[PDB]
């Protein structure tokens, strides 16, 4: 199949600041990969993003029957949906499973990457810290960053560059809104 | 902000593929099975707290379809430019031999939203337990998609996620096998 494709996307974006104190509704019309016309509630009316969308902007703005529905949508649409889905979306909190292990199985006193795996958590915001004998190491930390699994869970790998000597105690500390006190997992060399 | 809820719809010609979904901070809340006219909650537990009339989405698609025709003509038939996907294969959690895990095939930054994915265990197609998400929206108006394969990790098997998209020259294979 080599036929040309033509794509039309319509997007209604509800942006929420400080709970629902501030809400911004954004309707977007996109042909192929180009946004052509949009309604921004901060603007109050349609605006052509490209020349292709001009006949729709000046046309839709001509009907105050349409503009009133959209302007009011910040309440009847955005705030309503926030209210309905708040308990299972906004307030969703799944605790991370934390494990610590060296990447390479090898004799001691050789360079190794100590990985602190943090998986299955929600929401995304999190902080992972490495400690060596009770002292925080800030250098030599390599992270995969935040990874979205697509099933309402995140995972991340925070690795510490080290040459583990015998007797050393390495501790990974995770802070996350799903727990009131930091999760700590230790690895003893 | 703190949060974003997105109602994202698309219609694509000549495929006649339509989609209707809600997105929350990058995750799918639900979509509508167009053929069967039912609401599909990404996590089934969601449908225990909220409802959506799937029938309403079909009129949206009808409007989307009509508007596409008009817009194709307006641009005098500028076809979409294919953007090939970045493919990544990873696992749900750290791999432990002989302990159930899940292979995630992440397909990102592509358009149009048509892709073909097949899992390969030692070069053979696997369908058992496979699941996939619908096409998820991006700010740059490209798409993302996830494919899943539950599997039992072992030193004996290798895996490939095979993705074919019009932007690619040949089918892409991202390789996974246990390493240690």
């Amino acid at each position: 199949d080599t036929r040309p494709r033509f794509l039309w996307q319509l997007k209604f974006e509800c942006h929420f600041f400080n709970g629902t104190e501030r809400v911004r509704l954004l309707e977007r019309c996109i042909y192929n990969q180009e946004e052509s016309v949009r309604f921004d509630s901060d603007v109050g009316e349609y605006r052509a993003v490209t020349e292709l969308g001009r006949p729709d902007a000046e046309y839709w703005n001509s009907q105050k029957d349409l503009l009133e529905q959209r302007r009011a949508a910040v309440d009847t649409y955005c705030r309503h949906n926030y209210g309905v889905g708040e308990s299972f979306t906004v307030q969703r909190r799944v605790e991370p499973k934390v494990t610590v292990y060296p990447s390479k199985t090898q004799p001691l006193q050789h360079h190794n990457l100590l990985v602190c795996s943090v998986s299955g958590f929600y929401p995304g915001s999190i902080e992972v810290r490495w400690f060596r004998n009770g002292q925080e190491e800030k250098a030599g930390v390599v992270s995969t960053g935040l990874i979205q699994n697509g099933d309402w869970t995140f995972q991340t790998l925070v690795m510490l560059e080290t040459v583990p000597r015998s007797g050393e105690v390495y501790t990974c500390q995770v802070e996350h809104p799903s727990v009131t006190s930091p999760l700590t997992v230790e690895w003893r060399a | 902000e703190e949060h974003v809820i997105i109602q994202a719809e698309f219609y694509l010609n000549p495929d006649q593929s339509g989609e209707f979904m809600f997105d929350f901070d990058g995750d799918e809340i639900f979509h509508v099975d167009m053929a069967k006219k039912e609401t599909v909650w990404r996590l089934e537990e969601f449908g225990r707290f909220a409802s959506f009339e799937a029938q309403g989405a079909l009129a949206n698609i009808a409007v989307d379809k009509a508007n596409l025709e008009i817009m194709t003509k307006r641009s005098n038939y500028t076809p979409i430019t294919n953007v090939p996907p970045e493919v990544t294969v990873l696992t749900n959690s750290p791999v432990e031999l002989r302990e159930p895990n899940v292979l995630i095939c992440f397909i990102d930054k592509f358009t149009p939203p048509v892709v073909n994915v097949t899992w390969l265990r030692n070069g053979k197609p696997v369908t058992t337990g496979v699941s996939e998400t619908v096409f998820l929206p991006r700010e740059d108006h490209l798409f993302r998609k996830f494919h899943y394969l539950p599997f039992l990790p072992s030193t004996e098997d290798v895996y490939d996620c095979r993705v074919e998209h019009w932007g690619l020259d040949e089918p892409l294979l991202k390789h996974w096998e246990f390493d240690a």
């Binding site: 019309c29 649409y77 949906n81 | 409802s51 009339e53 309403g56 409007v63 989307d64």
Partner: peptide, 14 residues
Amino acid sequence: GSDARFLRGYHLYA
């Protein structure tokens, strides 16, 4: 009323 509400797109010009 625990329904997820939705908006419908307007028809393009012509």
